[PDB]
């Protein structure tokens, strides 16, 4: 007989990244208007500029 349903494109709820990501704000449907997170080189095992 004629084929009515033979599957199709399947929508996925989630996109799970497999790579470690740097901290970030919202950039999709929600756009964070605040300043992006500040990166600080805080903990140093050896003195650099002191």
């Amino acid at each position: 007989g004629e084929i009515i349903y033979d599957g199709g494109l399947s929508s996925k709820l989630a996109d799970v990244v497999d790579k470690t990501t740097e901290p970030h704000n919202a950039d999709g449907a929600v756009k964070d208007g605040r300043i992006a997170p500040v990166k600080l080189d805080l903990e140093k095992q050896k003195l650099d500029k002191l």
Binding site: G33, R34, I35, P37, E43
Partner: protein
């Protein structure tokens, strides 16, 4: 045009708000090494005749 410039300046100072800080907690951590051999310090001294 004057209102556009005034509203632009106000929005600029409203966008000057911090969100968060990110840093690394690494002080106090040191790299380990592996010792493959136990340092025993024993020698066996035996006479020529084995007595």
């Amino acid at each position: 045009e004057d209102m556009a410039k005034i509203y632009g300046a106000v929005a600029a100072v409203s966008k000057n708000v911090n969100s968060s800080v990110t840093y690394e907690v690494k002080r106090g951590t040191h790299e380990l090494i592996k010792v493959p051999t136990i340092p025993h310090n024993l020698v066996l001294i035996q006479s020529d005749n084995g007595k």
